[PDB]
């Protein structure tokens, strides 16, 4: 996922 990687970090 996106947040799976801290690039996103939207609490997943």
UniProtKB/Swiss-Prot annotation:
The record marks 5-7, 9-10 as: Important for binding to human alpha-7 nAChR. The modification Cysteine amide is found at residue 12. Not hydroxylated. Hydroxylation improves its folding but impairs its activity against target receptors. C-terminal amidation facilitates folding and correct disulfide pairing. Keywords: Acetylcholine receptor inhibiting toxin, Amidation, Cleavage on pair of basic residues, Disulfide bond, Ion channel impairing toxin, Neurotoxin, Postsynaptic neurotoxin, Secreted, Toxin. GO terms for molecular function: acetylcholine receptor inhibitor activity; ion channel regulator activity; toxin activity. It comes from the Eukaryota. Its main location: secreted. Disulfide bonds join 2-8, 2-12, 3-8, 3-12. Coiled coil: none annotated. Alpha-conotoxins act on postsynaptic membranes, they bind to the nicotinic acetylcholine receptors (nAChR) and thus inhibit them. This toxin blocks neuronal alpha-3-beta-2/CHRNA3-CHRNB2 (human and rat), alpha-7/CHRNA7 (human and rat), and alpha-3-beta-4/CHRNA3-CHRNB4 (human) nAChRs. Acts voltage-independently. Competes with alpha-bungarotoxin for binding to the receptor. Binds to a different site than alpha-conotoxin ImII. Is highly active against the neuromuscular receptor in frog. Also exhibits inhibition of D.melanogaster alpha-7 nAChRs. Belongs to the conotoxin A superfamily. The cysteine framework is I (CC-C-C). Alpha4/3 pattern. This is Alpha-conotoxin ImI. It comes from Conus imperialis (Imperial cone). The chain holds residues 5 to 16 of 17 of the full protein.
């Amino acid at each position: 996922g996106c947040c799976s990687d801290p690039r996103c970090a939207w609490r997943c």
